[PDB]
């Protein structure tokens with residue numbers, strides 16, 4: 001099964017991960033309603049998810065994809081946030097838990113910006129916030145997000161992704177690109193759980209802006 005390996009802060013691997021997270025905090029047009037109001041995170045833990053079988057599934061799919069993508073599996077490190085993280089780190093991603101509805105198709109979404117994924121830690125639009133205080137901007141409760149290896153293969157670009165069940169023929173992923181009457185940032189979508197490996201499990205808190 002899965003083994004979570006704690007990384008130490010002096011480890012350069014820890015420092016890269018936290019830097020990518022801290023440096024990708026972006027401005028969201030919702031006044032912080034979904035993910036809360038914060039300028040930085042308090043990263044309190046970064047664990048490496050080690051799962052032999054899960055890795056083998058990932059690499060096997062990566063091979064299939066590469067052969068259909070002129071030998072480029074096109075892997076990318078991206079963020080993912082959702083209430084399913086504990087289940088994911090133990091069994092791997094599962095597209096069976098992805099449904100068409102609202103602004104999303106039946107795929108698993110990833111973001112280049114940590115702050116975007118933070119908006120989904122407690123559910124779509126931040127849900128009702130943390131379980132304990134029902135505060136989307138809770139500075140107390142610990143949140144978790146994943147920094148994963150994502151096999152994109154041949155990506156199909158489009159503006160809306162809310163009605164997708166699978167990637168278009170010949171493709172392995174879909175990228176929702178920004179538009180004036182639509183998305184603010186790009187969203188990476190896969191429709192097969194095995195196209196993502198939850199490399200790092202980040203435990204953190206958003207920090208209140210300093211006075």
Ligand SMILES: O=C(CCSc1nc2ccccc2c(=O)[nH]1)N[C@H]1CC[C@H](c2nnc(-c3ccccc3)o2)CC1
Nearest residue numbers: 080081082084087093094097108109110111117120187
């Ligand atoms: O990606 C999304 C959209 C909203 S969440 C979201 N939306 C975004 C949109 C744009 C940019 C970033 C994000 C983001 O980070 N999260 N839903 C996903 C969330 C995780 C689900 C799932 N995957 N594996 C499982 C599983 C469950 C039980 C046992 C084992 C595995 O569940 C599938 C649907």
Ligand SMILES: [Zn+2]
Nearest residue numbers: 130133138141
């Ligand atoms: Zn709370």
